[PDB]
């Protein structure tokens, strides 16, 4: 629980219609972060459960 370092951030930035490229970049960054976090959390949970049962 503790190792999750948290900082005061503001996820989600509004953009104009013309600045669609920056919006797409922000969406790509958010999707990449989401995928990385989901994969890492799932693997960590599975490994920790297996190790706890073995222990």
């Amino acid at each position: 629980i503790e190792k999750m370092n948290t900082q005061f951030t503001a996820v989600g930035k509004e953009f104009n219609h013309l600045e669609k490229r920056i919006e797409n970049l922000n969406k790509k960054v958010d999707d990449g972060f989401l995928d990385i976090w989901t994969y890492n959390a799932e693997l960590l949970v599975l490994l920790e459960n297996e190790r706890t049962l073995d222990y």
Binding site: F8, A10, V11, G12, K13, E14
Partner: protein, 164 residues
């Protein structure tokens, strides 16, 4: 720290510019025509529009946010009837900013029962600086500025959740 400040007094800063008029039906209040309270839409005072030139000094210890506007009339006749000058120009200048605006007389598509346009601009003045406005017309003069001290930064939440 956010404080609304009266940068320009309404009854003393513009002796040669009429401030009573300028209301429009596009911004009604209780049925009668009205306008914004933070800005004043200056109009000619008896078919005469003297060259407006105003300056302000940021003596406070925090940043000052100032917003002004430029009015683009729908037709040349409206421009002449509102400012008595066929050709006009606006200049805004601070220690880190220098811009000149020109009117764009054109017939925009009718939106909200209006054919003209109004472009809104905002600027930040740091302490010890000076902000100057010059115009021969088509200027929406500021009336109230905002003293602020920017924080680390946050976001905007769009939801209908009630506040507790």
């Amino acid at each position: 720290s956010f404080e609304r400040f009266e940068i320009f007094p309404k009854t003393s800063s513009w002796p040669n510019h009429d401030s009573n008029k300028g209301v429009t039906a596009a911004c009604p209040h209780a049925g009668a025509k009205s306008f914004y309270k933070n800005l004043i839409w200056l109009v000619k005072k008896g078919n005469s529009y003297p060259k407006l030139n105003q300056s302000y000094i940021n003596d406070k210890g925090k940043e000052v946010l100032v917003l002004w506007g430029i009015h683009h009339p729908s037709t040349t006749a409206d421009q002449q009837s509102l400012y008595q000058n066929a050709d006009a120009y606006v200049f805004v200048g601070t220690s880190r900013y220098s811009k000149k605006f020109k009117p764009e007389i054109a017939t925009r598509p009718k939106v909200r029962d209006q054919e003209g346009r109004m472009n809104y601009y905002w600027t930040l003045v740091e302490p010890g600086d000076k902000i100057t406005f010059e115009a021969t017309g088509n200027l929406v003069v500021p009336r109230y500025a905002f003293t602020m001290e920017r924080n680390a930064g946050s976001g905007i939440i769009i939801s209908d959740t009630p506040v507790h």
